[PDB]
Design an enzyme around this catalytic site. Structure first.
Site, short mmCIF file in Angstrom:
data_model
loop_
_atom_site.label_atom_id
_atom_site.label_comp_id
_atom_site.label_asym_id
_atom_site.label_seq_id
_atom_site.Cartn_x
_atom_site.Cartn_y
_atom_site.Cartn_z
N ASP A 169 -12.23 4.79 1.98
CA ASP A 169 -11.03 4.43 2.73
C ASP A 169 -11.12 4.82 4.19
O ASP A 169 -11.60 5.91 4.54
CB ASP A 169 -9.80 5.09 2.11
CG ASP A 169 -9.16 4.23 1.03
OD1 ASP A 169 -8.65 3.13 1.38
OD2 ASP A 169 -9.17 4.64 -0.15
N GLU A 190 -0.25 -3.45 -5.60
CA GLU A 190 -1.30 -2.44 -5.74
C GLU A 190 -0.76 -1.08 -5.29
O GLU A 190 -0.37 -0.92 -4.13
CB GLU A 190 -2.51 -2.82 -4.88
CG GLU A 190 -3.65 -3.44 -5.64
CD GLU A 190 -4.84 -3.73 -4.74
OE1 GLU A 190 -5.09 -2.92 -3.82
OE2 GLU A 190 -5.53 -4.75 -4.97
#
Length: 261
Positions: free
Chosen positions: A60, A49
């Site tokens: 995040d 990823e």
């Protein structure tokens, strides 16, 4: 590289959980990103990823948050990433899944992306309105769009999600943001089952995972894959230097890989 759906399917036939590491493109620098991609691949990454930095990475935690700022500072752009992958993917034996918020990929043709050798794409904050757009766009360029589902999603929308996703189903393990977390949320246990109950698509768990006992537990529970980000950035990105950083990543990646066999 074989397609993500393909890579995932072969693993599950041999009854195994996929090791899916995540690093931020550009942290510390594109040149270090490449090398890192090879280490992970050499370590056993079944899928890698790769995060594309953007101005507002709000889904995040602070670890990746810091990882992105560094990425932007060093001069990383979507254009550069692909240029980097185009010459690196032909060296990787596993497919790469690009991950970025909708902002950086909305007014963009996905042809250049497939050209770089990228196989999959994940868009966390994908507006419900452009979902069919990106969806049709990805499949037209043979890019498998990986959709996520979290604990807050009702049973019924989850079925839809499972049906429209491609490559694998990204099962977010929590409602909060990305980041360490010392224990694996208990809800994941039954949720994994619930997902695999209405779909035969590969089911991968992400968010939190940062210790072997985590990968060990989530695997025994039936997951088809484990995605690990913050824990991986914490090794290569926060190291005192690129050199050390790659060393740490190698040591950590291999450690999380043994917790699967």
């Amino acid at each position: 590289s074989r397609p993500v759906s393909d890579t995932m399917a072969a693993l599950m036939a041999k009854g195994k959980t996929a090791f899916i590491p995540y690093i931020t493109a550009g942290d510390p620098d594109l040149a270090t990103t490449a090398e890192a991609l090879r280490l992970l691949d050499g370590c056993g990454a079944d899928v890698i990823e790769l995060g594309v930095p953007c101005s507002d990475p709000y889904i995040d935690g602070p670890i990746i948050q810091a990882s992105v700022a560094r990425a932007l500072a060093s001069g990383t752009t979507m254009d550069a990433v692909l240029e980097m992958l185009r010459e690196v993917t032909p060296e990787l034996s596993c497919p790469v899944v690009l991950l970025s918020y909708y902002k950086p990929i909305m007014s963009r043709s996905l042809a250049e992306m497939k050209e770089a050798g990228v196989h999959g794409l994940i868009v966390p904050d994908l507006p419900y309105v452009a979902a069919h757009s990106l969806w049709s766009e990805a499949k037209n360029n043979n890019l498998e769009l990986v959709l996520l589902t979290t604990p807050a999603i009702p049973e019924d929308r989850m079925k839809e999600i499972t049906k429209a996703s491609e490559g694998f189903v990204y099962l977010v393990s929590v409602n909060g943001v990305t980041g360490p977390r010392a224990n694996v949320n208990p809800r994941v246990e039954s949720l994994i089952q619930e997902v695999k109950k209405v779909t035969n698509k590969p089911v991968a768990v992400g968010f939190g995972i940062s210790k072997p006992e985590h990968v060990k537990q989530i695997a025994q529970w039936g997951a088809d894959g484990v995605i690990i980000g913050s824990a991986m950035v914490r090794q290569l990105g926060e190291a005192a230097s690129p050199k050390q950083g790659l060393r740490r990543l190698e040591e950590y990646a291999r450690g999380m890989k043994n917790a699967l066999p």
